[PDB]
Nucleic acid binder design. Sequence first.
RNA 1: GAAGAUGCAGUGUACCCGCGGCAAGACGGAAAGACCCCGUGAACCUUUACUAUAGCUUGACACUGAACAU
Length: 148
Amino acid sequence: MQVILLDKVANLGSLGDQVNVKAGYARNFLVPQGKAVPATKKNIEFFEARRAELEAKLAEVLAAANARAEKINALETVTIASKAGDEGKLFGSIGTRDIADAVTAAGVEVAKSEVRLPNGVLRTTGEHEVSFQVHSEVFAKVIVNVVA
RNA sequence: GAAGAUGCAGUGUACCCGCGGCAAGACGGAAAGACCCCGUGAACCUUUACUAUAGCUUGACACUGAACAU
Ligand SMILES: [K+]
Ligand SMILES: [K+]
Ligand SMILES: [K+]
Ligand SMILES: [K+]
Ligand SMILES: [Mg+2]
Ligand SMILES: [Mg+2]
Ligand SMILES: [Mg+2]
Ligand SMILES: [Mg+2]
Ligand SMILES: [Mg+2]
Ligand SMILES: [Mg+2]
């Protein structure tokens, strides 16, 4: 399948390219996500005349991602509370939904999809390092404090 | 004598007709022998008979994509 990339897609190419992908890749991911469109005469010529304004829509989104990230980096540490045993080990756990709400209430608004807990959910009291991904290339960070 | 005769030949016996009884024969009545054979007949059953086939199972392609390592 021939498609026209509407953004930077890693391992594929940059905005405006014309690449041959497997049909399933385009059908179930690139096109529904908005990352590409089928390379039909119209699209090709329309995207050719309509290009530099998308290049300005991308840099607007990339900067907006840079601005929200600096705010997340500005919260530094966010404390979360729960119940635990005496050995500090939680009975339940701490996932994305409640880390996101914690950062939301602490100021910066983050969705659960942006949280990236590397070592899974948090199941012990103390301080852990979680990461945030607000853009496909930028990456924020936050120290999370878990107390009983 | 189609080979076990009321009906043919020879011969013997025998007036015509009921009724109560008995079953030796009319190869008695009943059912186009079920046994046996035959038909290039039938059915259902069996199986390492033949040919197929549901099912079960194998791989290729499609629905079906992204990275990295070897
Ligand atoms: K006579
Ligand atoms: K009799
Ligand atoms: K035959
Ligand atoms: K039968
Ligand atoms: Mg005689
Ligand atoms: Mg009498
Ligand atoms: Mg009697
Ligand atoms: Mg008889
Ligand atoms: Mg007969
Ligand atoms: Mg037969």
